[PDB]
DNA sequence: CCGACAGCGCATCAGC
DNA sequence: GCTGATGCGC
DNA sequence: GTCGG
């Protein structure tokens, strides 16, 4: 947390560009700068120093100097006072409400938690659940709770079919002491890139988890991706645990490594790695790593037997999950 | 100084 | 109904 | 907003 003041400033700016300006490349730019500054092992003394880092340019360097000199950023002080920008930023905190829906709601006079609550019929399903658990989804998940959640999921999955393999990824796999949610990667021998010999593979599991009351709500559900809500059971006379976001992704068993790499992240780590792959003449997604033809057309999937193989293709030394938190 | 910026599942919509 | 674009959350 | 060619 050497440069927490600066990284928070950049994150707020990033959020403004994404939610209010609807400028996603500026959003990513600010996040990249925040990320590289966050891992910089020195307490930054000037914009010039920061500008030496990849991702920090002239503009951000100037902002860093203002921040260092005054402890504030006028551009942000103004934004904080703009009611429309403030309303839009708030509404986007509800899962399901993005930049477009937020502005739309503001236009229609809906701009507070109270307004949302009285206008549920104006929200789609995902948004309705996001509002319902607004407060809970704001809370972090202690690793101790992630362990109990892992136990339940793996044991219930085993009960459905012992051939299932569920792996908890995301920040948990990176060893974080707290997570924003739970990310489960799921595989089954019947589902491969070659064939889908058994249907309802994801459904069955989701069903079992709901049966035992672990999964409480569903945001979206398809053949391979489930996004919903879950909750740990509490003891007698015990206050209930907060509801949590859970994502379950069923990936072809032979594509497990590309899958676990993607689901482990971080998000910024994935973007940096996928961008580097391109510069190296490859393209990476959660399923495969393919070379780029002389015309920029993806070729056939390359053989992969470990996450390291992916790193080797793009000439990157291997990095354990714990070192991918960018 | 301009084009590129990672890549994709599900929900929702418009147009036919 | 299907296709394809858009919004959204990764 | 930043960076490479
Ligand atoms: N948040 C996010 N995750 C992404 C993106 N693209 C992408 O491949 N991912 C991957 C890397 C993440 O580790 C993984 C799971 O998403 P996540 O939001 O749960 O991220 P996380 O587990 O690292 O962090 P968290 O839950 O503790 O907030 O999805 C993206 O744009 N945003
Ligand atoms: Cl942009
Ligand atoms: Cl500020
Ligand atoms: Cl693919
Ligand atoms: Mg997560
Ligand atoms: Na720089
Ligand atoms: Na949102
Ligand atoms: Na997640």
Residue reference for tokens 């979206």: A220
Distances (CA, A) of A293 to A14, A280, A300, A303: 34, 12, 10, 17
Name the token pair of A170.
């995301």
By CB atoms closer than 10 A (0-12, 13-18, 19+), residue A114 is exposed
A200, exposed or middle or buried, with CB in 10 Å at 0-12, 13-18, 19+? exposed
Distance CA(A36)–CA(A55), nearest Å, equals 7
Distances (CA, A) of A220 to A60, A141, A167, A244, A287: 38, 22, 20, 15, 21
The torsion angle over the Cα atoms of residues A164, A266, A101 and A222, rounded to 10 degrees, is: -10
Q: Report which protein residue has its CA nearest ligand 1's atom 14.
A: A263
Domains of chain A: 1-82 (1.10.150.110), 83-139 (1.10.150.20), 140-262 (3.30.460.10), 263-325 (3.30.210.10)
Whole-angstrom distance, CA of residue A282 vs CA of residue A173: 26
CA dist A309 and A302 (Å) reads: 10
Instruction: Give the nearest nucleotide to A181, CA to C1'.
Output: C10
* Peptide bond before residue A266 is cis, with ω within 30 degrees of 0: yes
| Chain length of chain A | 326
Residue the block writes with tokens 């009611």: A83
**Separation CA A48–CA A23 (nearest Å):** 26
Does A25 contact strand D, using a CB cutoff of 7 Å? Answer: yes
Query: How was this entry determined?
Result: X-ray
Instruction: Give chain A as a 3 state SS string.
Output: CCCHHHHHHHHHHHHHHHHHHCCHHHHHHHHHHHHHHHCCCCCCCCHHHHHCCCCCCHHHHHHHHHHHHHCCCHHHHHHHHCHHHHHHHHHCCCCCCCHHHHHHHHHCCCCCHHHHHHCHHHCCHHHHHHHHCCCHHHCCEEHHHHHHHHHHHHHHHHHHCCCCEEEECHHHHCCCCEECCEEEEEECCCECCCCECCCCHHHHHHHHHHHCCCEEEEEEECCCEEEEEECCCCCCCCCCCCCEEEEEEECCHHHHHHHHHHHHCCHHHHHHHHHHHHHCCEEECCCCEEEECCCCCECCCCCCCCHHHHHHHCCCCCCCHHHCCC
Other CB atoms within 10 A of residue A175 CB: 12
Distance CA A44, CA A61 (A): 11
Cβ of A180 closer than 6 Å to ligand 1, yes or no, is: yes
Q: Which residues contact A229 (CB under 8 A, 6 or more apart)?
A: A129, A133, A215, A216, A217, A218, A219, A243, A244, A245, A246
Write out which nucleotides of chain D lie closer than 7 A to a protein Cβ.
1-4
Entry resolution in angstroms? 2.0
What crossing angle do the helices spanning A83-91 and A74-81 adopt, rounded to 10°? 80
């Amino acid at each position: 947390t050497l440069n927490g003041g600066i990284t928070d400033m950049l994150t707020e700016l990033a959020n403004f560009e994404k939610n209010v300006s609807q400028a996603i490349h500026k959003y990513n730019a600010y996040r990249k700068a925040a990320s590289v500054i966050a891992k910089y092992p020195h307490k930054i003394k000037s914009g010039a120093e920061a500008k030496k880092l990849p991702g920090v340019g002239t503009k951000i360097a100037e902002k860093i100097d203002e921040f260092l000199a005054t402890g504030k950023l006028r551009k942000l002080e103004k934004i904080r006072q703009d009611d429309t920008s403030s309303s839009i930023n708030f509404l986007t905190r509800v899962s399901g409400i993005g930049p477009s829906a937020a502005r739309k709601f503001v236009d229609e006079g809906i701009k507070t938690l109270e307004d949302l609550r009285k206008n549920e019929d104006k929200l789609n399903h995902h948004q309705r659940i996001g509002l319902k658990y607004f407060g809970d989804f704001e809370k972090r998940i202690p690793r101790e709770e992630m362990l109990q959640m892992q136990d339940i999921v793996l044991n219930e999955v085993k009960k459905v079919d012992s051939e299932y393999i569920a792996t908890v990824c995301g920040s948990f796999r990176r060893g974080a002491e707290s997570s924003g949610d739970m990310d489960v990667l799921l595989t089954h021998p019947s589902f491969t890139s070659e064939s889908t010999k058994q249907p309802k593979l994801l459904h069955q599991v989701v069903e079992q988890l709901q049966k035992v009351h672990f999964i409480t709500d569903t945001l979206s559900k398809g053949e391979t991706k489930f996004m919903g809500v879950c909750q740990l059971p509490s003891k007698n006379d015990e206050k209930e645990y907060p509801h949590r976001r859970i994502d379950i992704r069923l990936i072809p068993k032979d594509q497990y490594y590309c899958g676990v790499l993607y689901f482990t992240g971080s998000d910024i780590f994935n973007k940096n790695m996928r961008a580097h792959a391109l510069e190296k003449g490859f393209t990476i997604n959660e399923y495969t790593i393919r070379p780029l033809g002389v015309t920029g057309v993806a070729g056939e999937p390359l053989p992969v037997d470990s996450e390291k193989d992916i790193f080797d293709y793009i000439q990157w030394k291997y990095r354990e999950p714990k070192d991918r938190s960018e």
